[PDB]
Scaffold this active site. Structure first.
Site, PDB file in Angstrom:
ATOM      1  N   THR A 130      84.324 -44.494  34.962  1.00  8.04           N
ATOM      2  CA  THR A 130      82.997 -44.596  35.547  1.00  8.04           C
ATOM      3  C   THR A 130      81.892 -44.453  34.519  1.00  8.04           C
ATOM      4  O   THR A 130      80.709 -44.482  34.849  1.00  8.04           O
ATOM      5  CB  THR A 130      82.831 -43.617  36.695  1.00  8.04           C
ATOM      6  N   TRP A 132      77.418 -46.758  42.534  1.00  2.00           N
ATOM      7  CA  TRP A 132      78.244 -47.564  41.641  1.00  2.00           C
ATOM      8  C   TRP A 132      79.633 -46.965  41.454  1.00  2.00           C
ATOM      9  O   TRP A 132      80.683 -47.606  41.746  1.00  2.00           O
ATOM     10  CB  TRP A 132      77.600 -47.735  40.321  1.00  2.00           C
ATOM     11  N   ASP A 133      79.671 -45.755  40.935  1.00  2.00           N
ATOM     12  CA  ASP A 133      80.907 -45.084  40.622  1.00  2.00           C
ATOM     13  C   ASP A 133      81.621 -44.587  41.856  1.00  2.00           C
ATOM     14  O   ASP A 133      82.875 -44.546  41.911  1.00  2.00           O
ATOM     15  CB  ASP A 133      80.620 -43.891  39.684  1.00  2.00           C
ATOM     16  N   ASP A 170      80.977 -40.255  32.800  1.00  2.00           N
ATOM     17  CA  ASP A 170      79.870 -39.882  31.921  1.00  2.00           C
ATOM     18  C   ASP A 170      78.761 -39.133  32.600  1.00  2.00           C
ATOM     19  O   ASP A 170      77.621 -39.152  32.147  1.00  2.00           O
ATOM     20  CB  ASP A 170      79.342 -41.085  31.175  1.00  2.00           C
ATOM     21  N   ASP A 192      78.664 -40.283  39.118  1.00  2.00           N
ATOM     22  CA  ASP A 192      79.974 -39.859  38.547  1.00  2.00           C
ATOM     23  C   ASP A 192      80.559 -38.660  39.312  1.00  2.00           C
ATOM     24  O   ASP A 192      81.765 -38.598  39.576  1.00  2.00           O
ATOM     25  CB  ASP A 192      79.869 -39.518  37.058  1.00  2.00           C
ATOM     26  N   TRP A 235      67.412 -40.385  32.161  1.00  2.00           N
ATOM     27  CA  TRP A 235      68.594 -40.493  33.036  1.00  2.00           C
ATOM     28  C   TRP A 235      69.651 -39.452  32.684  1.00  2.00           C
ATOM     29  O   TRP A 235      70.391 -38.961  33.540  1.00  2.00           O
ATOM     30  CB  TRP A 235      69.204 -41.870  32.938  1.00  2.00           C
ATOM     31  N   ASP A 280      75.770 -41.269  29.880  1.00  2.00           N
ATOM     32  CA  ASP A 280      74.680 -41.037  30.877  1.00  2.00           C
ATOM     33  C   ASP A 280      74.508 -39.584  31.247  1.00  2.00           C
ATOM     34  O   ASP A 280      74.078 -39.257  32.371  1.00  2.00           O
ATOM     35  CB  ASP A 280      74.932 -41.923  32.104  1.00  2.00           C
ATOM     36  N   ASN A 323      76.990 -49.575  31.395  1.00  2.00           N
ATOM     37  CA  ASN A 323      78.239 -49.019  30.885  1.00  2.00           C
ATOM     38  C   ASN A 323      78.847 -49.891  29.794  1.00  2.00           C
ATOM     39  O   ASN A 323      79.410 -49.397  28.818  1.00  2.00           O
ATOM     40  CB  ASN A 323      79.282 -48.803  31.989  1.00  2.00           C
TER      41      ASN A 323
HETATM   42  N1  AGV Z   1      68.872 -45.759  37.415  1.00  2.00           N
HETATM   43  C1  AGV Z   1      69.886 -45.219  36.737  1.00  2.00           C
HETATM   44  N2  AGV Z   1      69.962 -43.875  36.607  1.00  2.00           N
HETATM   45  C2  AGV Z   1      70.986 -43.345  35.951  1.00  2.00           C
HETATM   46  N3  AGV Z   1      72.006 -44.015  35.381  1.00  2.00           N
HETATM   47  C3  AGV Z   1      71.979 -45.353  35.501  1.00  2.00           C
HETATM   48  C4  AGV Z   1      72.862 -46.351  35.047  1.00  2.00           C
HETATM   49  C5  AGV Z   1      74.150 -46.186  34.298  1.00  2.00           C
HETATM   50  N4  AGV Z   1      75.342 -45.782  35.201  1.00  2.00           N
HETATM   51  C6  AGV Z   1      75.037 -44.955  36.410  1.00  2.00           C
HETATM   52  C7  AGV Z   1      76.323 -44.889  37.131  1.00  2.00           C
HETATM   53  O1  AGV Z   1      76.937 -43.618  36.845  1.00  2.00           O
HETATM   54  C8  AGV Z   1      77.172 -46.084  36.674  1.00  2.00           C
HETATM   55  O2  AGV Z   1      78.404 -45.677  36.080  1.00  2.00           O
HETATM   56  C9  AGV Z   1      76.298 -46.855  35.676  1.00  2.00           C
HETATM   57  C10 AGV Z   1      75.631 -48.087  36.267  1.00  2.00           C
HETATM   58  O3  AGV Z   1      75.092 -49.015  35.322  1.00  2.00           O
HETATM   59  C11 AGV Z   1      72.329 -47.561  35.425  1.00  2.00           C
HETATM   60  N5  AGV Z   1      71.164 -47.330  36.082  1.00  2.00           N
HETATM   61  C12 AGV Z   1      70.912 -45.975  36.154  1.00  2.00           C
HETATM   62 CA    CA Z   2      78.772 -43.283  35.294  1.00  2.00          CA
END
Ligand code: AGV
Ligand code: CA
Ligand code: AGV
Ligand code: CA
Ligand code: NI
Ligand code: NI
Ligand code: NI
Ligand code: NI
Ligand code: NI
Ligand code: NI
Ligand code: NI
Ligand code: NI
Lengths: 325, 325
Positions: free
Chosen positions: B140, B263-264, B13, B18, B86, B43, B189
């Protein structure tokens, strides 16, 4: 008769735009002899802004042999601090791969202690007063350092200033400070320390050229333009400016037209190309109150306000400068 | 007996993380044959995520001759959308100088129409069901695409999945979804589409390896590490990953320890290095309610939860992969 460079100091506050302005000045030694930089804890965290300034200085010294110069952290403090989120951009820049070339990091680490000892306000005063030629001061953050120097040294300082080219204010257009306690009429650099701006802008003893939102509204940072750096990605300065701008191209969408602009970059461009805008003498009455209009710069001559800047000349100058190395 | 690559699809995403995951997979053709990418409007804004995926594919094809592959935009829609701020990161990336090399932009523009015609959900189904070898799906972003495929095709789809390696959830630690309407127990996610996650995670017919916050909390993105890319700035992939990470190193300060993590990227690293973590079988009970715990993945086996990942192995893999070109 055209072959001699202007002596310039950059008094900045370390946002992305500030660094584009630094790059434009420093990449053009035929036109500008950059003899110092001041960094203020306004639209950055000053340690990050200091480190980015130092590393850019070192990279350009390596690639095109521009001289090293003193850098000083101002101890000026906010009246109305910047939003915390905006202030982090210099940290992001400090961490960029183009700002972590081993040789550049090593040279900066060597030079950092001598620079750490500087007080930024005092350094601004000293560089101006000791310079052989009169000095152009480019002010791309708040006016606190200039105010300090004027207050402490008066004529001995103002008499050595060629002109002061300032990013700030909003004269005949709305501002950019949108908070529950403000009316939207003020611009951020003024709003950070309104008394300092009042002290400088109407000081009758310095020529001030003001790039207010009136002019800077011509140069929003937009994807269509920023993508042009890709064709020049082999140049370090294009990696730098392209990245600095690419970090900001969403803001016009996010804020429904209230873009990230080339505010400081256009300001610096005037030093390089004085025909880039027309000047209008204007008397201003800087609002230093605690009401909703705090920091407004309405019409009451105090300054020469930039009008009708050339987008095309600006574009051409930025793209050429970022092919220097 | 070790010399043959795994067939992989990335279902992502489009946040910075990612794309680091995509780079790790695509830069390692000895280990991974990347046969497709899906991008979901979670995202990111999907058009930006699509374009970044395409340009990275084209750049790697140019530099190291990894094959081109189909890319599809999912039409999955949010239950609980991501914060708008984000979602802009893929726009910033689309505008970066390293993503605007003229040759890469030109190839992508040529390939874009055939890819635009794809529906992402259908493409995921088709690639899995038509593949000669069983396929590892790296997920992811949200689980919406996998859920769609399971619902439509059942065994004909699940029987062709080697394993599904998923970034999501929080089992024995707190979540990362902090809103007035949530209790902080859920991970984003999952929270974006809780019913889809419930449908996949406890599908008894697929092997799911889950990188939840339990494991990903080991790999915050921090300046000390990110600065290491400077020594490798001559490599396009180091410019890419270093910039992607440098855009995020302030978040741990900003949010008082609640970092931007790898994370990913760590999730993808498991496909490359299955010994990077230990697996614990766990039964989960995905919260699909509209209460404050919506999207929580508490313990009720549904999945194999990653435990005790190796920071050092991760670091080494990222730095090596980003020297590939
Ligand atoms: N601080 C942050 N900034 C952007 N996306 C996220 C997310 C959501 N996403 C970001 C990663 O691609 C991962 O797949 C997921 C983590 O919750 C959580 N916190 C974020
Ligand atoms: Ca992601
Ligand atoms: N959207 C934004 N992001 C960061 N800083 C700012 C500012 C403050 N700064 C940024 C430029 O360096 C310029 O000197 C001044 C413009 O008000 C206004 N809007 C901002
Ligand atoms: Ca500034
Ligand atoms: Ni001359
Ligand atoms: Ni030297
Ligand atoms: Ni000194
Ligand atoms: Ni152009
Ligand atoms: Ni083998
Ligand atoms: Ni080809
Ligand atoms: Ni197709
Ligand atoms: Ni290391």
């Amino acid at each position: 008769g055209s072959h001699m460079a202007k002596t310039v100091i950059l008094d900045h506050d370390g946002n992305k735009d500030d660094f584009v302005a630094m790059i434009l000045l420093l990449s053009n030694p035929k036109k500008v002899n950059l003899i110092g930089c001041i960094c203020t804890d306004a639209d950055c965290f000053v340690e990050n802004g200091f480190d980015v300034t130092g590393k850019i200085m070192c990279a350009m010294h390596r690639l095109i042999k521009t001289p090293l110069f003193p850098i000083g952290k101002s101890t000026a403090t906010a009246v109305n601090a910047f939003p915390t989120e905006w202030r982090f951009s210099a940290k992001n820049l400090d961490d960029m791969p183009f700002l972590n070339i081993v040789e550049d990091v090593a040279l900066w680490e060597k030079l950092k202690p001598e620079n750490e000892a500087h007080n930024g306000q005092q350094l601004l005063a000293d560089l101006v007063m000791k310079s052989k030629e009169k000095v152009t001061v480019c002010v791309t953050g708040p006016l606190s350092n200039m105010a300090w120097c004027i207050e402490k040294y008066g004529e001995a300082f103002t008499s050595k200033v060629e002109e002061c080219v300032i990013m700030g204010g909003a004269v005949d257009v709305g501002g950019n400070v949108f908070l529950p306690t403000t009316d939207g009429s003020a611009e951020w650099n003024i709003y950070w320390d309104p008394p300092a701006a009042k002290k400088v802008l109407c000081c009758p003893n310095i020529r001030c050229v003001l790039f207010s939102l009136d002019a800077t509204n011509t140069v929003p940072v937009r994807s269509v333009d920023v993508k042009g750096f890709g064709a020049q990605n082999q140049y370090l300065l294009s990696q730098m400016v392209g990245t600095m701008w690419a970090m900001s191209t969403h803001e016009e969408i996010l804020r429904d037209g209230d873009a990230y602009y080339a505010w400081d970059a256009l300001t610096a461009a005037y030093i390089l190309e004085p025909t880039i805008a027309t000047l209008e003498p204007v008397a201003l009455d800087v609002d230093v109150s605690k009401g909703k209009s705090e920091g407004r710069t309405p019409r009451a001559p105090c300054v020469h306000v930039a009008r009708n800047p050339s987008k095309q000349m600006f574009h051409d100058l930025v793209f050429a400068s970022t092919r220097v190395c």
